[PDB]
């Protein structure tokens, strides 16, 4: 069984730069989490490497037949959230920049081991964040990447972010991750 701690640890010990880490980790997930490379909209994918980083195990997102189960209606809470403002990007602000500011609303409000689903320009694509306590790691284990905003095409740091650019950060609770870890769904996935 995959250990996630073990996986931080020896990312952690590397010469990479924060990007390049979590590159490192979403690739890692992907190939257990999706293993399938579809490319759907597998907001499952997101909140299975939320339950992975949260210690829950690692399990293989729902399929798309599977949405039915439990991700059909996973964020019935969080819609006014999922479809407000948000965070914007600024003119001529860099991918590494507009990364950078996310990352402080996170750490600003999440503490230390707490992850959080992070929707693109109003759940038009979603991926993960994980607070290690220091930084926050970005995931997108549906496609095995780092922080990106679903451009159809790769975007290094120093890139420029599209006018009015977005993301909300949905700070899904501890309950609801519970629940769903307790729910057959969950159980019926395949673990790692």
């Avoid at 609303?105 to 693109?120: A, C, D, E």
Wanted: hydrophobic content about 35%; overall charge negative.
């Amino acid at each position: 069984n995959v250990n996630v701690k073990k996986l931080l640890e020896s990312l952690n010990s590397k010469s990479l730069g924060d990007m390049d880490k979590d590159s490192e980790l979403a690739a890692t997930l992907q190939k257990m989490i999706n293993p399938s490379g579809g490319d759907g909209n597998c907001s499952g994918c997101a909140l299975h490497a939320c339950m992975a980083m949260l210690g829950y195990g690692v399990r293989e997102a729902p399929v798309p037949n599977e949405i039915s189960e439990y991700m059909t209606g996973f964020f019935h809470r969080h819609l006014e959230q999922i479809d407000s403002e948000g965070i914007v990007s600024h003119p001529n602000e860099t991918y590494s920049k507009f990364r950078e500011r996310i990352a402080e609303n996170i750490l600003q409000n999440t503490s230390k081991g707490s992850v959080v689903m992070i929707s693109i320009e109003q759940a038009t694509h979603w991926i993960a964040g994980f607070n290690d306590g220091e930084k926050i790691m970005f995931l997108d284990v549906q496609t095995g990447k780092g922080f990106n905003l679903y451009d159809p095409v790769e975007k290094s740091p120093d890139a420029f972010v599209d006018e009015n650019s977005s993301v909300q950060v949905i700070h899904v609770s501890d309950q609801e991750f519970d629940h769903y870890a307790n729910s057959s769904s969950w159980k019926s996935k395949r673990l790692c």
